[PDB]
Structure 1
């Protein structure tokens, strides 16, 4: 059975209750920002590549009020954050910028405040609630960042585009969480549309909505509930390796490189560098092709490209893990599935399976049996992106 995904009104109700308790009054302001699953296009965003994510009904809700004292007071209800669940700190000033510290979870919020481009920002009181599993590879980090950004807009309206907001949150993750992420997770949290995946061009920042308007078609997310300790360990190593292959080929990014230049420049780069870069040029072509397939309603072919994505991620990019491999195989055994693959950064988190809606019950029953650990499941539809909730 799939996990019940609580609606915005339920999270917003728990957020109001926890806030009213903590601060002594009803909060004035509220926002939501969703998590995400990448259908295909993994380890391409920081290579100026193509990705095809959708926003989930799994989301972070922030409620709060402005203060007059220039302090920030936070409570997260998520049990997976490092303690304390409470933190206060002063707004950054001309005299003193914020610095990352403990607890680590608040570094995400500190970073978005630090880089928020509009002034004057007042202090505020806020509670965070989330149905996005922390560390699940469904972007709880981006969801928290974009909820924070969208809350700050309610206190002090910004002047810029949705791309700039995504880049503020990305910068927060780089400087304050030490995670050199690409733009995808922030961009989909902001830009998601109900009943659509987004083809995102991480070079141009052009976005194409592709309809997911088909009740025969189900996206199943399977959480391995494994988080191996290569996560924010081997991810920065892959990004730097890609960037060295590009510079040693004289390209601004691997987006500017094709498999034929790469094969011809094999002696200019490490054996490992070649393999990383082979995944990325392949993956960019696969996600352009997969987008076109999805538009024409050719699920068979989209599934094929998904399974080629998994193989490439597992062997050439080495960011899968026995648990994710086992889920992907178990899912491909089930009559009615088009494809299955790891989604997110890897070394744990979730798989994304595309299949016939009528197969979902069997798919779940099968996968859980044929999995060593304990999988949770989500039947997900493409959700809206970040919005204001008027209290």
Structure 2
């Protein structure tokens, strides 16, 4: 996978060809994979993501124009890959429009809490596959936010940055996500997974640094997204039915006692959340002591839960997981992200990765892409 220096150079060449000068500021923000703890973040639960070596790099310079001039080199983006617009004012504010990819940067600008924000020129380069479930969106948003910090440093907390980037995805991209993706992109540490408590936003670094251990990401290359807001609504319905603020304050037994207060579908939805939250806490402890096969088994429980109770999996994802579990050296595997496509995360012995890639691909009714990634750092400034 491409490294920051190679990407930074690509962004510099493109900025030169496009604007005639060298960029003055450089910034990067990684993608992410969730090892376990799915569909718990908007339930104030626990998550265990790690930052990927896949990355977004932004280079640029301030302008006197009050204008924003943007260029992205990613081919999978909505055309046109270039866009320019004036800075928002108290009079007129930015508006979500076309091209779609620029809405992510527009939103971060609109909700940035510091002033005065100058105009700027910038080019975007990325090794994060757009729409593949590794949070290219969050990578883009956090990169933009980190870039704006160079033009106009902010005062508030890191959590505010995550919430600023999340607000943008809500209002300008129309996707009501949780804080997880933005948070891991901001808070990742290389050679570590990040156990995130989405109620208190307290953070715990769980070491992930074993040359014998590999994390295999498999993209199903499918994306069937309209049920995510439906699941979010169901969980809230069950929390009200039980007189609770969120499903995090609910454990299985209390859910069992109140079975008749919620719908049958609602009960299965809540059962995943309550069970995933505990599975996540168990996986963090298992990972601290190096119990990889225990962690792998918790990964498979998560997948079963996501497949049957939460119903956000799909045949492609299910087929990928089973093939992965047939390969020797695999500790566990499951879908990651929202579901209905996207990627599969697999914990396995590093030596088994080549064979795992061959076996998974051969038993998959479709084209599969693979990324072998280590735990990486979060957003950072790059000195040019």
> 2: CA distance between counterparts of 1:227 and 1:267?
35
Q: Deviations over 1:292-318 (max 9, x none)?
A: 000011111100110000001111111
> 2: CA distance between counterparts of 1:241 and 1:71?
43
Per mean C-alpha deviation after superposition, the further-off stretch among 93-102 and 42-51 is 93-102
Per mean C-alpha deviation after superposition, the further-off stretch among 130-139 and 11-20 is 11-20
After superposition, residues 164-175 of structure 1 pair within 5 angstroms as 164-175=160-171
Q: What is the Cα deviation at residue 49 of structure 1?
A: 0.3
Q: What is the Cα deviation at residue 269 of structure 1?
A: 1.5
> 2: CA distance between counterparts of 1:241 and 1:23?
49
Q: What is the Cα deviation at residue 233 of structure 1?
A: 1.1
> 2: CA distance between counterparts of 1:245 and 1:102?
37
Q: Deviations over 1:115-144 (max 9, x none)?
A: 101110001111111100000000000000
- Equivalent residue in structure 2 for 1:149, among 145, 150, 153: 145
Counterpart in 2 of 1:213?
209
Per mean C-alpha deviation after superposition, the further-off stretch among 191-200 and 358-367 is 358-367
> 1: CA distance between counterparts of 2:262 and 2:16?
58
Per mean C-alpha deviation after superposition, the further-off stretch among 87-96 and 112-121 is 87-96
Q: What is the Cα deviation at residue 289 of structure 1?
A: 0.4
Displaced runs of 4 or more, over 3 A? none
> 2: CA distance between counterparts of 1:234 and 1:79?
28
> 2: CA distance between counterparts of 1:100 and 1:68?
24
Find the residue that maps to 1:279 and give its secondary structure. Answer: helix
> 1: CA distance between counterparts of 2:94 and 2:228?
25
> 1: CA distance between counterparts of 2:262 and 2:174?
27
After superposition, residues 1-391 of structure 1 pair within 5 angstroms as 5-228=1-224, 232-391=225-384
Q: What is the Cα deviation at residue 244 of structure 1?
A: 1.3
Q: What is the Cα deviation at residue 167 of structure 1?
A: 0.7
Per mean C-alpha deviation after superposition, the further-off stretch among 145-154 and 155-164 is 155-164
Q: What is the Cα deviation at residue 213 of structure 1?
A: 2.2
> 2: CA distance between counterparts of 1:57 and 1:149?
19
> 1: CA distance between counterparts of 2:278 and 2:7?
39
The number of residue pairs the alignment matches comes to 384
Q: Deviations over 1:148-198 (max 9, x none)?
A: 000000000001121111110001011111111011111000100010000
Structure 1 gaps, min length 5: none
